[PDB]
Amino acid sequence: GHMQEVVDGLWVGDLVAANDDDELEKNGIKNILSALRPSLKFSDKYAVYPLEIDDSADTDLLSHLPSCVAWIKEILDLRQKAARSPDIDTVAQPGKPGGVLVHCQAGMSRSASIVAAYLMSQYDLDPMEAMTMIREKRPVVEPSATFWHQLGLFYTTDGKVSLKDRSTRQYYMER
């Protein structure tokens, strides 16, 4: 498939998956975390978090990870009750009661890194443990080198991006 379910209600996938409304409906997905530039035009059937970032060696994903993690938590909590967090960027639409697909163009780097950050925060995993958990469902995932580094910074600071950490401050200084 073009998307795979990592844990209950949380999917990672590619550009094909984001456009396949049949598969999204069949799996009860009503939220899309869309990590792509330019942003796509989605139907209002979905709540969408447009993350306008590239998959480049100088892309800053770290600054957005607390917002991404909090948005996924907002959705999955709401989905369970059906059966705002100050961390969430205001461009993220209010979560709807259903699953969430996190996607980029290929479903390997931006999207897998965002899902890994969520798994690190939710299950107290380190980046490798998180990424292995995803890879066992979607074997092609492979963060870029800079995303692996940024996941390490996110791990160190317990998911609050703090520049009291030397390495995090250094990352932002070099940018």
Ligand code: VO4
């Ligand atoms: O389109 V993604 O390259 O960040 O797998």
